[PDB]
Design a protein around this ligand. Structure first.
Ligand code: MG
Ligand code: MG
Ligand code: MG
Ligand code: MG
Ligand code: MG
Ligand code: MG
Ligand code: MG
Ligand code: MG
Ligand code: MG
Ligand code: MG
Ligand code: MG
Ligand code: MG
Ligand code: MG
Ligand code: MG
Ligand code: MG
Ligand code: MG
Ligand code: MG
Ligand code: MG
Ligand code: MG
Lengths: 88, 218, 129
RNA sequence: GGCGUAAAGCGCACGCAGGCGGUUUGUUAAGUCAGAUGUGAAAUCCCCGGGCUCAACCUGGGAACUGCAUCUGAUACUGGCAAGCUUGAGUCUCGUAGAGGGGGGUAGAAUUCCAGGUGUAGCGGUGAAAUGCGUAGAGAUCUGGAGGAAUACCGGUGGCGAAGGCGGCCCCCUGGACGAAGACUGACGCUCAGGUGCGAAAGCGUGGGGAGCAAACAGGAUUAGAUACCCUGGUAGUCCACGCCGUAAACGAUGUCGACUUGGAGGUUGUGCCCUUGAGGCGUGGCUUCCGGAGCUAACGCGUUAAGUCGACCGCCUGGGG
RNA sequence: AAAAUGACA
């Protein structure tokens, strides 16, 4: 469920500052880390319908942020989708 | 004039929030009745009353609750005015044409025991009238010396006498009312906040309003 | 979410007088302050205040000539979902001229009695009776 | 114009196109507003006019044809561009309450059945009664064993979930809400046609399981008949795994998202200060039941969780039967 | 326990 140490690593790797939590880059990374870890969970618990609703909120939220970045900084945005790997 | 300060009151935990500009707080989760705001408006109506009492306005005093009942007969019937010490017969003001007939019947009823029907006929039809006399004299008293509709009403409980106000509100009669923490300020245009259900408190009101009636006519 | 903040500003006045409150307070904006300057002119309300730095919060004062209120009918006319613009000869009339209608002409905020006597015209911000 | 009860809110959510969009500064001039230029055939319409003896009827001048295009010029609003701003929305740290979900185990009460021991003549059932069970030992009672389903007490208009709904105890995968103090991102927001997902119980398909209940069915009784209610039995089903179905009085008969507007009695759940002095007292956040003021309206009633005052989008309604 | 029904004006 992306514990604190599992989160304290991504925020520094993607964020611009040691305390830069909240920028568009780090927010997306913290979602794709939950999303691409929850692939294993729903491999086993397939009919976990109630949890799956929470994931579809994560996937939906991520696309909302990436649209905002795409309208803001094209070079920064297309750098982001490849240093993480998505958008196919 | 905050001379005594003996009627903090508070009447309850609940309230009608329409007296928010008339309250403070106390440690018992209950609302302190203002005495600083009370003083100026209180003497306004006394000044107003003296302006109307000089033209013989037939002041009416309404005290119905048991505790303050007797002191109304010590203020209204004391000087010249009228009281309703016991329950208010619904419609006594707007339905005057019917209470008028019953007051006239009373005047016969009292004299039906002076020189009429007390001993010259059967007690089942002579004494029973006195049972109707006693039911009347406390249910309809000092108003027996009236000559029509009054011009100034004076009430103590703005809630316990909320139906006497409406008849007065129905006509044009201005009224002085001693509202409380639980009371309603609207309807009555001459607001006098303060605790009511205390003999040491009512004496402050009645004893210091009947004086203004006294000075109006002289 | 709030989308017509002007329609919010008027409603504070409506409920402020229904509750018989002395004054109201709400966040400030340049169009709002211009609106409140107009109502300061026509005697609907007394002076106002715009104290605020990062939360500029306008603070009006409601007016009671008698026990009653003064702003009897204040309604939003050109809402965002349907905006209406009027021209110099078709300016709306409120209670045969006894009220006013606020028009934001090309030369700043104004009322239909001064824009009519200036040859101008614009969007009908609201009505105030 | 409406949508609690008269016809009318999709069962619930996610969401592309579309609609709408906080606050400041600059700039553009597309919407918008102001003038002119050109065009808007004549007549008919309308104002002041004239001629037939009046009128109907002809006729002169205006005004109107709300329009569309260009040229000038205004910049308050909307839209575009750019730079910010923190209030909206989201992220981070600490902690809280939970029948929220998926999977795997295990306990104890009871019912049924099976193998036995004492034990006698009835048991069971009804408004009465009969069917039925029993001398082949029934019913009652004690011991041992096997199975499936459901979790008494706590338990409460208590809690969680978007809705459907969720209830013994433990474990490990997992979702969302809440609060204090802080830091960051800086419009990233609301709504949603067509789409996508979920969606009680019953039913369906392929396999398992089957104690108790029990549609269908049978016998007894009631009744004028009784294809019923009552009684004795009893099949699918109820239970599990995996795929369907997509409907309910799926109801608060009340779409989602904001802001504003007197009060009481509680519950539950964080919490930050005096009086940690022991109760407590003071505060304030989130959910929730009841009564009620203004207001609303056909009345019932609703009422800070509005059906009150407004703003944005979405669905639906047009006499009853057919 | 049993207790069904009553043309229109
Ligand atoms: Mg999350
Ligand atoms: Mg209608
Ligand atoms: Mg209906
Ligand atoms: Mg619904
Ligand atoms: Mg749909
Ligand atoms: Mg704006
Ligand atoms: Mg233009
Ligand atoms: Mg023409
Ligand atoms: Mg002529
Ligand atoms: Mg702009
Ligand atoms: Mg939505
Ligand atoms: Mg089923
Ligand atoms: Mg089956
Ligand atoms: Mg049966
Ligand atoms: Mg339906
Ligand atoms: Mg339901
Ligand atoms: Mg419905
Ligand atoms: Mg209520
Ligand atoms: Mg027949």
């Amino acid at each position: 469920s992306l514990s604190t140490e599992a989160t304290a690593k991504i925020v520094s790797e993607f964020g611009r500052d040691a305390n830069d939590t909240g920028s568009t880059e780090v927010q997306v990374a913290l979602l794709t880390a939950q999303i691409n870890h929850l692939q294993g969970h729903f491999a086993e618990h397939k009919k976990d319908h109630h949890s799956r609703r929470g994931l579809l909120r994560m996937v939906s939220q991520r696309r909302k942020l990436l649209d905002y970045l795409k309208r803001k900084d094209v070079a920064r945005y297309t750098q982001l989708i490849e240093r993480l790997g998505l958008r196919r | 004039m905050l001379k005594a300060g003996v009627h903090f009151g508070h009447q309850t935990r609940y309230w009608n929030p329409k007296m928010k500009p008339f309250i403070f707080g106390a440690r018992n989760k209950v609302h302190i009745i203002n005495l600083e705001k009370t003083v100026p408006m209180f003497n306004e109506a006394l000044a107003e009353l003296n302006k109307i009492a000089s033209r013989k306005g037939k002041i009416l005093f309404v005290g119905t609750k048991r505790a303050a009942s007797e002191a109304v007969k010590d203020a209204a019937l004391s000087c010249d005015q009228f009281f309703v010490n016991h329950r208010w017969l619904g419609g006594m003001l707007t339905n005057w044409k019917t209470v008028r007939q019953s007051i006239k019947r009373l005047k016969d009823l009292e004299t039906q025991s002076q020189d009429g029907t007390f001993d010259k006929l059967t007690k089942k039809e002579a004494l029973m009238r006195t049972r109707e006399l006693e039911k009347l004299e406390n249910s309809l008293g000092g108003i027996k010396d009236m000559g029509g509709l009054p011009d100034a009403l004076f009430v103590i409980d703005a809630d316990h006498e909320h139906i006497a106000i409406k008849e007065a509100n129905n006509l044009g009669i201005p009224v002085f009312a001693i509202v409380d923490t639980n009371s309603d300020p609207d309807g009555v245009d001459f607001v006098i906040p303060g605790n009511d259900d205390a003999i040491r408190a009512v004496t402050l009101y009645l004893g210091a309003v009947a004086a203004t009636v006294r000075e109006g006519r002289s | 979410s709030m989308q017509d903040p002007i329609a919010d500003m008027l409603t504070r006045i409506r409920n402020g007088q229904a509750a018989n409150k002395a004054a109201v307070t709400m966040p400030s904006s340049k169009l709002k302050v211009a609106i409140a300057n107009v109502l300061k002119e026509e005697g609907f309300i007394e002076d106002f205040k715009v104290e605020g730095d990062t939360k500029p919060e306008l603070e009006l004062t409601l007016k009671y000539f008698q026990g009653k209120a003064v702003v009897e009918s204040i309604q939003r006319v050109s809402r965002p979902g349907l905006r209406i613009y009027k021209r110099k000869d078709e300016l709306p009339k409120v209670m045969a001229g006894l009220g006013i209608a606020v028009v934001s002409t090309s030369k700043g905020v104004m009322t239909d009695r001064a824009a009519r006597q200036a040859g101008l015209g614009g969007e009908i911000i609201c009505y105030v009776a």
